[PDB]
Ligand binder design. Sequence first.
Ligand SMILES: Nc1ncnc2c1ncn2[C@@H]1O[C@H](COP(=O)(O)OP(=O)(O)OP(O)(O)=S)[C@@H](O)[C@H]1O
Ligand SMILES: Nc1ncnc2c1ncn2[C@@H]1O[C@H](COP(=O)(O)OP(=O)(O)OP(O)(O)=S)[C@@H](O)[C@H]1O
Ligand SMILES: [Mg+2]
Ligand SMILES: [Mg+2]
Lengths: 101, 455, 442
Amino acid sequence: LPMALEYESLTDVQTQIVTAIQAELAHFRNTAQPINLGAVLQEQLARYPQSRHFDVARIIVDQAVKLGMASQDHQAVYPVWQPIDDFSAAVQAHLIDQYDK
Amino acid sequence: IARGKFRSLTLINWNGFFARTFDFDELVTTLSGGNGAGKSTTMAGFVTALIPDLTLLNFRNTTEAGSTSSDKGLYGKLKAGVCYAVLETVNSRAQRIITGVRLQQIAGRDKKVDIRPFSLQNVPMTDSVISLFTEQVANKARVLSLNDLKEKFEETAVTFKPYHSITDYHSFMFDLGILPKRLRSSSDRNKFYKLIEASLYGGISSVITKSLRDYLLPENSGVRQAFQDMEAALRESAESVANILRKTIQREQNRILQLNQGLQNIAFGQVKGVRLVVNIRDTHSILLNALSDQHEQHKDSFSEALAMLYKRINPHIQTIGEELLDYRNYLDLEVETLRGAYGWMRAESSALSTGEAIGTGMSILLMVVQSWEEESRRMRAKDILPCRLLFLDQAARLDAMSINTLFELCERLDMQLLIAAPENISPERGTTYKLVRKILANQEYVHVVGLKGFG
Amino acid sequence: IARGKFRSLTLINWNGFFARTFDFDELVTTLSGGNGAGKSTTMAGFVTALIPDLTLLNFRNTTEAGSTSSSRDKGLYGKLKAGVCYAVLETVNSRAQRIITGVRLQDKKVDIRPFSLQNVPMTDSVISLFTEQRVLSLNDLKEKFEETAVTFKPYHSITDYHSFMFDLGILPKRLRSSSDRNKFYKLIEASLYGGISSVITKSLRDYLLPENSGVRQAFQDMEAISAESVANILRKTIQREQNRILQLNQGLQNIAFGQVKGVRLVVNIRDTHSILLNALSDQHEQSFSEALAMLYKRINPHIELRMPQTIGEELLDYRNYLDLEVETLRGAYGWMRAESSALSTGEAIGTGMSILLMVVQSWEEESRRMRAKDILPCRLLFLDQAARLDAMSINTLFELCERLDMQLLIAAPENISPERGTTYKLVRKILANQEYVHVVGL
Ligand SMILES: Nc1ncnc2c1ncn2[C@@H]1O[C@H](COP(=O)(O)OP(=O)(O)OP(O)(O)=S)[C@@H](O)[C@H]1O
Ligand SMILES: Nc1ncnc2c1ncn2[C@@H]1O[C@H](COP(=O)(O)OP(=O)(O)OP(O)(O)=S)[C@@H](O)[C@H]1O
Ligand SMILES: [Mg+2]
Ligand SMILES: [Mg+2]
C-alpha cells in the first residue's frame, strides 16, 4: 500500500482568446452595426488554425448572444443555414440587432 | 437500402419559443445551454409530437425516475393562443413528411390541454416548415389554426389530413416508416412511450426489465391461429408441436444471438459489454424434452391435452394448456453487463454507477428497437425503413469516454440522438444548438444559435 | 466566534482502495474523473460513516430517484472488499480537539460496529493508525491505545455513537430514537440525489418546527382547571417559531438557479385550527384535551372520526396548527409554490438544496440548549452529479457556504471542475483483474 500525492496544473489560454473576442465583438456594441455571425465567423476562422476551430465558434456565439438578440426573431421565419469554411461547418442565426442595457 | 431521418422539430408559440425550428443532424443533435434554458422542454415538444396521448404523457423531473406517483409537465411549456409541435421526415422514398401535433390551452381552472394530430404531404422543399403556420399582419406574426391551414392548402398540390383517433395519426407515421412498431391497441402505446421516457431519464429502465420478454419477443399471431386450426381438422399432430417450439425458439435465439454481437466494443466506465442471455424454464425445458424422447400417449382439445402434460413434469401449482403454446412462456430472458471483475454480471443498478447504468440502459433500448423494426418487415414494404432515435437528457452524467462510445454506436447501427448537455462543453461531431433564455417585457424568450459541419 | 468542520474522510480495504485519505476542503470539496471511478462510493462510506444503520443505508442508483422498491440489495456490500474494512472521519471541534469517528465493516449481508478515538496527536497520520507493515484488526488495535494516550470505545447500541458525536460537536441534531435518525439519513439522501426531497415537502413541519416537550407533561399533570392560557401559549409559540423561519428566509434571497431567484417558507395558520385560537382568544361558553376535542366538534369540516385526549393531545402540539409550504421565485409570476413538475433539473436541485439548509439551520438551533455553548456544530451536505448545474448555478452554491458557514462535498464526472478549493481526480484501471483506482489531485 503506497501513497504520495501529486497536483497537476491546467493552463487554458482560452481566457485570452475570450478577452480578444470580447473586445472584437464588443466592438460591434459601440456602433449600431449588428453582429452577423455569418460574417463574424467566416472571417474569424481564417485567423486561428482548424485545430481549435470548434471552440472558437462556441465562444463567438456564447459572446455574440450575451450582448443582444436578433430583431427579426419575432417575425417567425426559418433561419437559413448560412455556411462558412470551404468544407462543411455552418451557422444558423439571424443578425443580432437591438441591445440589452 | 435507404433509411428515413427526422429533419426538424419546430415548436410554435411554446414557453420561450415562438417560432424556433430545430434542425436534426444525420447523427447527433446536442442542445447546449445553461440551467432552466429550454433543452428538456424542446424534447418535451418532440415526445408530444409522437405520443399525443395525454394518458401516458407525463414529464416528471430528472430528479424522479422511479416515481410511481402519478399536476403534469405538458401544460406550462406552451403559452396563450395556438401552438404546435411538428416533425420533418426524410422517408426512405425521399418524401418530405410533416407529422405534427396542434395544441391550445384550456379554460384556466385546471391545467388541462388539447391535442389534434395532423400531417402535411407534398410540401415544396422551397417553403420552410415554419412558413406553414405564419402570416404577416402589421409586422407581427400570427399563428394560424388548423382550419386556417386547411384553407391555405384546400386547393393545392399539398394534401392535409386532420386526425381524430391517435391510431389514425400513429398508423400514418408507421405506414410511411416514421414509427418502427405497430401502434394499434393502446396497450402498445404504453410499451413505446415508456421506451421514449426511458431514453430520457436515462439508465436501466426498470419497467422494461420485468416484462423484458414483452418487448424483445414477437408472439406469433400465426402460431395460435394455424396451430389451433389443425385441431379443427383432426377431430373430424402428436409432437409436431414440440418440434415447432424448439425451432421457433432456436430461431429467435439466433435473432438475439446476433443483436448482441452488435454490442461488443462498447465501453462505458467499466461496462465492456451487454448481452441478452436467453434461458429456458426447466419447467418447460423438460416439457420440451418430454414431448420429444419419451412417449406416454393419451389421445382422448390439444390445448386441454397439453395441460394434463404439465401435471407430468410439474408437481407444483385449461389455461395451463393453451398458454403452454406461445414461444415466450418457454423462456426466461435477462441482461448482463461485462466488466473486468466477475466476467459477466446480471445487470443491476445497485451494483452500477450513474454512467455505467445509462449506457446499459441505452443498450437495452437499442435492442428494443432492433427488434420492433425487423419484427415488422412483413407488414411493411421492401422499400421502406423506419427511423431510429433516442434521448439522453442530462447527458453530462457521461464523461468523454462514455459519451463518445454512444456516438460510434449510432454510427454503428444507423441512428440519431437528441442529447442535451446542461453544460456548454460537448461533442464536436454533429449539430449544436446553444440556448439562452432572455427576458423582454417580462416574457420568456429563448435564444438559439446553430452549428453543424465541424468534422 | 467559533466554528467546527471536516478535515478528512478515510477508506480502508474498500473495493478499489486499499487505504485512502481524502483531506476535506475548507469550504468546498469536489471529485471528478471517469464514469464509475470511485466517486459516489467514496461518499457512500461518508454516508455509512455518519449513519451506520443497515436498515437506512440504501444506495440505489441515480437513475432511480424515488424508488420505494426496497426489495433489492441495499448496495454497499460489493462496494468494499472482504475481511477487514473501515470508515473514518476527521473533524475539529469548536474547541479544536481533533476527533476520529467511524466504523469497521465486514446471501449478501454486511456486519458493522462503530467506534471512537479521542486524545490522538495530530502529527500522526491516521493512515498509519490502521495500517501495519497489512491491517491490524480491531483486537490488535485496542492495545495500541490503552497504556498510551487515546480513547477507543467498542460501541454496543448505535444510539450512543450519535449520542457521542452530538455531545462532542458534529451532529446538528439529537439522534435519540429511530424516528430521529430515519429523518436524518433522508436529508443526507436528499443532498446526494438532489431535487425537492419528495419526503420532506409532504411533512415539512416535521423537519423544521420542533416539539416543546413540556407543554405536554406540565399541562396534563396540573388537574391531578385552565382557560385562555393554553390557547395563549400556542399563539406565542407559533408567532415565535414563525419569526424564526422569517429570518431563515431572509438569507436565501439572492439565489440564482435557472430562473429561480428565491425560495421561501410560507408559514400559514390552518383555517380549522385558526378558528380555535380566535375562539379561545376572546370568547367562552360551557382531560382539558377533551374540552378542546369538543370545541373542535363545533367547527364542521369534512373528515370526521375519536378519543378526546388523542385529539386534545393533537391540539396542544402547536405544530399541528400550522401548515408549511415551500415557494420559489421567477421572473414570471415569481412567488409560486415550488413544484418538481415545474422547475428544471437545475432549479430543482437548487431549491431542494435550499430547504435542506432550513432543516440543518433549524435543527442546529433546535438544540443549542442541550449542548456546550462554546461549540457550534458542523454543517455539510452533498451533491452527486453536480454536472447538472451550470456556472452561475454552481457559483451561487459556493457563495452560500460563505453565507451559511458550511462545507459541501460534490461530485462531477465532468472533466471540468471549478478552481475555488482543493479538487481530487480519480482514475480506475484494471490490475491483475483486481479493481484498482489511482487517486491524484488537480
Ligand atoms: N410545467 C411547467 N410549468 C411552468 N414552467 C415550466 C414547466 N415546464 C417547464 N417550465 C419552464 O421551463 C424552464 C425549464 O425548462 P427546461 O427545458 O427543463 O430547462 P433545462 O434547460 O432542461 O434545465 P436543466 O435540466 O436544468 S439543464 C423553467 O425555467 C420553467 O419556467
Ligand atoms: N454493489 C456493488 N457491487 C460491486 N461493485 C460495485 C457496486 N456498486 C458499485 N460498484 C463498482 O464501483 C464502480 C462505481 O463506483 P462509484 O464510485 O459509484 O462510481 P461513480 O464514479 O460515482 O459513477 P458516475 O457518477 O457514474 S461517474 C463500478 O465500476 C462498479 O464495478
Ligand atoms: Mg455514481
Ligand atoms: Mg430539465
